[PDB]
Amino acid sequence: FKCYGVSATKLNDLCFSNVYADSFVVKGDDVRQIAPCQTGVIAD
Amino acid sequence: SSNFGAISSVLNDILSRLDKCEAEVQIDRLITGRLQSLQTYVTQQLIRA
């Protein structure tokens, strides 16, 4: 996968305040448009 | 009037041709270069004074 800001290997150690998970179904090639500040109008 | 390695030397041309994640690096380069120039001018002024 991809992690933006927190390394996935070191995720097991640090503690968080609250974690939020989202349900989301999207086309196959559109998965690369789910990123911060993406240019997609459909993503917009 | 120098670009400091950015795609253009005018800030308004940067903000009228890029989004808010590709213009950030160019803005950073302008900030660094102009900060260096202003600091150099301040130091020379202090010694001359």
Swiss-Prot record, chain B:
Protein name: Spike protein S2'
Species the sequence originates in: Severe acute respiratory syndrome coronavirus (SARS-CoV)
Top-rank taxon, per record: Viruses
Function (record text): Acts as a viral fusion peptide which is unmasked following S2 cleavage occurring upon virus endocytosis.
Coiled coil (UniProt feature): 1-27
Full protein stretch here: 949 to 997 of 1255
Gene transcribed to yield this protein: S
